[PDB]
Design a protein around this ligand. Structure first.
Ligand code: CAC
Ligand code: CAC
Ligand code: ZN
Ligand code: ZN
Ligand code: ZN
Ligand code: ZN
Lengths: 314, 329
C-alpha cells in the first residue's frame, strides 16, 4: 500500500512513471562529506542533480529509485534535498554493493540482516528516512561474503516485504547463482529484480528467469560496444514472449561519480546528454515505433514498478 | 612553529604535556559510526565510554592523545571533539589513509591525494573546521602501487605544512625501511616521520638503524598481548603473544643504545572497534583494563624500576612528542 521515500511515505498511485535503478551520486561511504570539492562542491552537485531530475520530470518521470547503498556513498540528506527541489519522489536503498569496508566485510549474516533491517524499519543514519529497497551485488559465481549479503537481504525482505534488486555481470549469467541463493532462503522471485540484465544477448537466460517469476532489470540501456537500440530490443523480445509484467527499465545514470577515474562523469554526459531522460525520450518512442502499444509501455513503466516496490509478502 | 592543531583548536606546544602519540577513540570505517551506531551500543554509549577512559588517563597524568584514525578508519572528528572537551584531554586528529581505502580513494592520483590531505590540514575536516595535526599512512609487506602514492602525497603535504607523518608497519616485515626510502626520495626529513608499531619486533638492528637516521620510533602497542588467549585465533593474530614487558623492554633497549630522543611510546588503545571480529573490544578490555592509562600506570613504573631516570622518561613522554608534533619545515 505505501512506499517509503526520502520525503516520507507515498501511496502506490502517487509513484507514477518510475525509474527503478538510478543514482544521484556514485561514490563511497563518507566521501561526499569528507571531500565535496571532488565534485566542485556539494552545492554544485546538488544543483546538477536538481536540473537533471527536473528534466526527467518534464519527460514524464515521477519517481526514481536510488539504488546507492552505504558503500556507494549514499547521502540520503542530499537525496532529500534534491527530491524536494525537483519535486521527484526518490526511494532510497539499503544493502551492500561491491566496495564494503572492513567493518562490513567482517560481519556475520545475522549482523548484516540487523543493519539492513535498521535502514528499512528505523531509518538511515539519524535522518528518520527509511529505505524502500535492498540493493545487492555479486561478481563471478558469488564470493563467500556476497553470499552472506544476499542471504541477509533475503531475510530483511522477508521481514518487511521490501523488494531486493541486484547488480550482476549478465555476460557471466550471474543472475542464476543469485536466484539459487534467494530461493534457498524462501524468498519469492516476485520480490527480486535481477539487474544489469541488458548487458547480454542471451535471451534464453532472461526468459528462464522471467518464467520463474523474477523481475528483469533492463537498466543500463544508454551505457554504450553494443548499441542502445540492441539493448532496447531485449525489452521487445520479452514483451513478445508474454513477460511484460516481468520487465523493469532504467538508465542507471548518475549526476556525480567518484568511484571511478577522474572526469568519467564528463565522458558519460557527452555520450548520453539526455541523462535520466534517455529512457522516456529515446527508448519509449523507439519501442512505439516498433509497434509496442501505449498500454504495454505504461504497464512497464508505471504498473510494474508499483507492484515491485509496494511492500508485500504475497 | 610552536602551535599545533587539536580538535578544540590550536594550542601552544607547552600545553601538550604528557602525550600518547598513537591512539584511537574508535577503530571503524568511513561512514560506519553514523550509519550503524548500535553496533557500539549507541553513539552516546561510545562517547561515554571514551570519556571515562580519557578521564582515567588524565588522572594518571596524560594531557594529550594523538588519534591516528584516518578517513578509512572511520574517524568521526565531531566525536573526537565531544570527548576531548568532556574529558578535558587534548586530541590531535589525523589525515592520511590507512589500509582500507574505498574505491573513491583507491582510484585517485598522487596529486589528488595531496590535495585531500592538504584540505584536512589547512582548511578542515569535513564541514567541522577542525584541522588535522598529523598525517597517518599505512603499508603492509612490500608497498603496493597505491600505498606508494599515499606515502608520496603524505610527504608532499608534510613538506608544504610542517605537519608530521606517522606510519603503520608490519614490523616483522621490517616495513619501515621501504617507507623511509620513499619518504627520503621525496625530500622529507626523517625527523618529521614516526615509524609505527615498531614494538611488534625484537629486531634491535632494524630499530636502531632507523633511529640512527633520525626517524622517530613508535613503540606504540605496549599492552597488546594475547598471552593466556592462545586458544583465540583472532585475538592472537591481532595482539601477538609477546608480553607487554617484552614490548616495554624495547624502550630501555633504545635508550641504552643512545636513542632516547627518537622514542615515542603509546598504547594504541581504542574505545570501540568495528573493523575486526565482533567481541574483539571486550577481549582487549579484559587483557588491559587500564586502557590508555596503561603507559603511565604500568609501563612508566616498570621502566623506573629498571633504573631509567625520571628525566629520561619525561623526555620521552613529553619532550619527544612536542618536538615531533610542532610543525617544522
Ligand atoms: C554503480 As553501477 C555501474 O554498478 O550501476
Ligand atoms: C587500527 As591499528 C591495529 O593499525 O593501530
Ligand atoms: Zn551495478
Ligand atoms: Zn547502479
Ligand atoms: Zn596500525
Ligand atoms: Zn592504531
Amino acid at each position: 500500500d505505501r512506499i517509503n521515500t526520502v520525503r516520507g511515505p507515498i501511496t502506490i498511485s502517487e509513484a507514477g512513471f518510475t525509474l527503478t535503478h538510478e543514482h544521484i551520486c556514485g561514490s563511497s561511504a563518507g566521501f561526499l562529506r569528507a571531500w565535496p570539492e571532488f565534485f566542485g562542491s556539494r552545492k554544485a552537485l546538488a544543483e546538477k542533480a536538481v536540473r537533471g531530475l527536473r528534466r526527467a520530470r518534464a519527460a514524464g518521470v515521477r519517481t526514481i529509485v536510488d539504488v546507492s547503498t552505504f558503500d556507494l556513498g549514499r547521502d540520503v540528506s542530499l537525496l532529500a534535498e534534491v527530491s524536494r527541489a525537483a519535486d521527484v519522489h526518490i526511494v532510497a536503498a539499503t544493502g551492500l554493493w561491491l566496495d564494503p569496508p572492513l567493518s562490513m566485510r567482517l560481519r556475520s549474516v545475522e549482523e548484516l540482516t540487523q543493519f539492513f533491517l535498521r535502514e528499512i524499519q528505523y531509518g538511515i543514519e539519524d535522518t528518520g528516512i527509511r529505505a524502500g529497497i535492498i540493493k545487492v551485488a555479486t561478481t563471478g559465481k558469488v564470493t563467500p561474503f556476497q553470499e552472506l549479503v544476499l542471504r541477509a537481504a533475503a531475510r530483511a525482505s522477508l521481514a518487511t516485504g521490501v523488494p531486493v534488486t541486484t547488480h550482476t555481470a549478465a555476460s557471466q549469467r550471474g543472475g542464476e547463482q543469485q536466484a539459487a541463493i534467494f530461493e534457498s532462503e524462501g524468498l519469492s522471485p516476485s520480490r527480486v529484480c535481477i539487474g544489469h540484465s541488458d548487458d547480454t544477448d542471451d535471451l534464453s537466460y532472461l526468459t528462464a528467469l522471467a518464467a520463474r517469476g523474477y523481475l528483469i532489470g533492463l537498466d543500463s540501456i544508454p551505457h554504450s560496444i553494443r548499441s542502445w537500440q540492441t539493448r532496447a530490443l531485449l525489452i521487445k523480445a520479452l514483451i513478445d514472449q508474454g513477460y511484460t509484467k516481468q520487465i523493469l527499465v532504467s538508465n542507471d545514470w548518475l549526476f556525480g561519480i567518484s568511484s571511478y577515474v577522474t572526469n568519467i562523469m564528463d565522458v558519460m554526459d557527452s555520450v548520453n546528454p539526455d541523462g535520466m531522460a534517455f529512457i522516456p525520450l529515446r527508448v519509449i518512442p523507439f519501442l512505439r515505433e516498433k509497434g509496442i502499444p501505449q498500454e504495454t509501455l505504461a504497464g512497464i513503466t508505471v504498473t510494474n514498478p508499483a507492484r515491485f516496490l509496494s511492500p508485500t509478502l504475497r
